[PDB]
């Protein structure tokens, strides 16, 4: 008789994995013992299609950080997680002064210390994050670009003047909370090709669902 | 109310719009079975 599970909040709860940073010792990948991750909630595959059910949305995100070595090991290493709000400058190097700009919230924690966890508010200067924008910002490549949907960047790095002694891997989970949505719309039935637009494969246009032989046979 | 693709048989890219509607004609004699399907919202087939 109850329908608590079919609510928006119920549907979008759960902290999913949306990011993974690699900080190897020897490597082509993030060679300066640091990394910048612009917040992308599409990071959880399944996500995109779920949110793209609505035209507008609003919510808060709870971020939880999981860090270890590639084998999932724990070591005595301290870390800095920096959140650079949109409009704030991300660090270009492992010594950029951005790391010390008070206006960039930062949180420190040892790998041993349990997961780091913080809540981030509804940033957008607009009244709601909008997944679809039918226009351009005052044939073009700026089509469908609602920038005021930026949540910010997360800069991660080993604390200290020198490179870390261990190879590290950070995982970022994100639980969406206090959700409100407007204007529902057709469930994506075609495969996604790009993170930006809704473009699809005009050759590989598949029928929404399983087909059959005749309309008289089951 | 959403359109149920009962006629989920053509797959030929340009005939996909045909899945949305099935037809009836003079050629069909009295008693003939026009169409059939199950009440399986979540399973494959029409309800998708």
């Amino acid at each position, epitope marked *: 008789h109850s329908t608590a599970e079919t609510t928006l909040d119920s549907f979008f709860s759960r902290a999913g994995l949306v990011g993974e940073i690699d900080l190897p010792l020897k490597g082509t990948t993030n060679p300066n013992g640091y990394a910048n991750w612009d917040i992308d909630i599409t990071g959880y595959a399944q996500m995109r299609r779920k949110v793209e059910l609505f035209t507008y949305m609003r919510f808060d995100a709870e971020f939880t950080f999981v860090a270890c070595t590639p084998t999932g090991e724990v070591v005595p290493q301290l870390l800095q997680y920096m959140f650079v709000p949109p409009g704030a400058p991300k660090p270009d190097s492992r010594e950029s002064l951005a790391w010390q700009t008070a206006t960039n919230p930062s949180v420190f924690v040892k790998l041993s210390d349990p997961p780091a966890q913080v809540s981030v508010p509804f940033m957008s200067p607009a009244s709601a994050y909008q997944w679809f924008y039918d226009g351009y910002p005052t044939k073009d490549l700026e089509y469908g670009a609602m920038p005021n949907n930026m949540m910010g960047t997360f800069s991660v790095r080993t604390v200290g003047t020198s490179k870390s002694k261990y190879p590290l891997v950070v995982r970022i989970y994100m639980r969406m909370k206090h959700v409100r949505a407007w204007i529902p719309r057709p469930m994506r039935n075609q495969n996604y090709l790009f993170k930006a637009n809704p473009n699809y494969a005009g050759n590989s246009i598949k029928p929404t669902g399983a087909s059959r*032989t005749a309309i008289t046979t089951l | 109310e959403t359109i149920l693709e009962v006629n989920n048989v053509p797959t*030929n890219a340009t005939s996909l719009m045909e899945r949305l509607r099935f037809p009836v004609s003079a050629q069909a004699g009295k008693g003939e079975l026009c169409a059939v399907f199950r009440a399986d919202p979540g399973r494959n087939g029409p309800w998708q």
Partner: antibody
Framework: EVKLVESGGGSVKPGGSLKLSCAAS????????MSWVRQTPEKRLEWVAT????????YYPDSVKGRFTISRDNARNILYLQMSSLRSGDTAMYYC?????????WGQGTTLTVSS | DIVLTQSPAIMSASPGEKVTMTCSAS?????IHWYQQKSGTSPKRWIY???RLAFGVPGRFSGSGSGTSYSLTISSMEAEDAATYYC????????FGGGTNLEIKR
């Protein structure tokens, strides 16, 4: 059982006309489209015509469009294929098939030999 | 004017080993279907929409392919499979492939 059993054929001289027929059994005929296919001496398969579930549309390939005509009578569950101005290249074994596209069941075929 | 070329034309398996027949197209294609034809008997239905099996077909038969190159795979092979296998396309002019004579090795 679904049965497609066809009739007609034999030796015909080039230029003559012929009509082939195929009888249905064990499925509601009107709800299906029906096609003919021919097999050259056990190797090559070539589509020759289809007919819609009712009268509706007929569809032909570009080797035959002009001489063959496919028909159905949905009272006796039977396809028809009349072939006029038959040529030497029309010698083959003709199957009637049911179209669900994909061809589920094929009949056992009749054989056509166009020759002088 | 859409041609399907099948390779190889003749094949021989041990049996108990796998078998990979190929249907290549001259242009990009949406799906491919497969038939079977033993001697004296008409073509039987085998695979449709590339990877779905007709009711009868053993589970040891497989189907895949995308775009312009599709293939029917059999693992493992058994003396009851030896037939000629044709592919077919449904996009424009309904064309058949040349077939593949599958045979028993001894």
């Amino acid at each position: 059982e679904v049965k497609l059993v066809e009739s007609g054929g034999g030796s015909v001289k080039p230029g003559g006309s012929l009509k082939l027929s195929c009888a249905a059994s064990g499925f509601s005929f009107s709800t299906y489209g029906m096609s003919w296919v021919r097999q050259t001496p056990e190797k090559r398969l070539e589509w020759v015509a289809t007919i819609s579930g009712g009268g509706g549309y007929t569809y032909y390939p570009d080797s035959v469009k002009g001489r063959f005509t496919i028909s159905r009578d949905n009272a006796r569950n039977i396809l028809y294929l009349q072939m006029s101005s038959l040529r030497s290249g029309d010698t083959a074994m003709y199957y009637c098939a049911r179209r669900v596209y994909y061809f589920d069941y094929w009949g056992q075929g009749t054989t056509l030999t166009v020759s002088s | 004017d859409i041609v399907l070329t099948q390779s190889p034309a003749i094949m021989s398996a041990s049996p108990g080993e796998k078998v990979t027949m190929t249907c290549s197209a001259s242009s990009s294609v949406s799906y491919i279907h497969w038939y079977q034809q033993k001697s004296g008997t008409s073509p039987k239905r085998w695979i449709y929409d590339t990877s779905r099996l007709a009711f009868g077909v053993p589970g040891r038969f497989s189907g895949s392919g995308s775009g312009t190159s599709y293939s029917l795979t059999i693992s493992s092979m058994e003396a009851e499979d030896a037939a000629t296998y044709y592919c077919q396309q449904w996009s424009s002019n309904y064309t058949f492939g040349g077939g593949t004579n599958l045979e028993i090795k001894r």
